[PDB]
Amino acid sequence: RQLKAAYSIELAQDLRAVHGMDADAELSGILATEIMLEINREVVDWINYSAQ
């Protein structure tokens, strides 16, 4: 499983300013968390899939 993300440099500046959060870490904090949720869903999904 894999995922990608595309953030512009100027967005990193604006997000670092104004609000005050690093634009880079959020996408890493989103993609990695999202993938783990899907796998954690797939394990649950298979159980109901295979249940009698």
Partner: protein, 52 residues
């Protein structure tokens, strides 16, 4: 009679470089002040008469 024509020159000496840069005038023509937001706002405060 061995003249200078018999001898062969080597790498010519590099006496001088020559770059071309304009006499940039913008630190003197305008008033500069760095902004910490992507949108910069100027306040115009004016004094009026009863006739505005």
């Amino acid at each position: 009679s061995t003249t200078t024509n018999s001898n062969s020159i080597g790498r010519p000496n590099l006496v001088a470089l020559t770059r071309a840069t304009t006499k940039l005038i913008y630190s003197d023509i305008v008033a500069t002040q760095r902004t910490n937001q992507p949108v910069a706002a100027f306040y115009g405060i004016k004094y009026l008469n009863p006739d505005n």
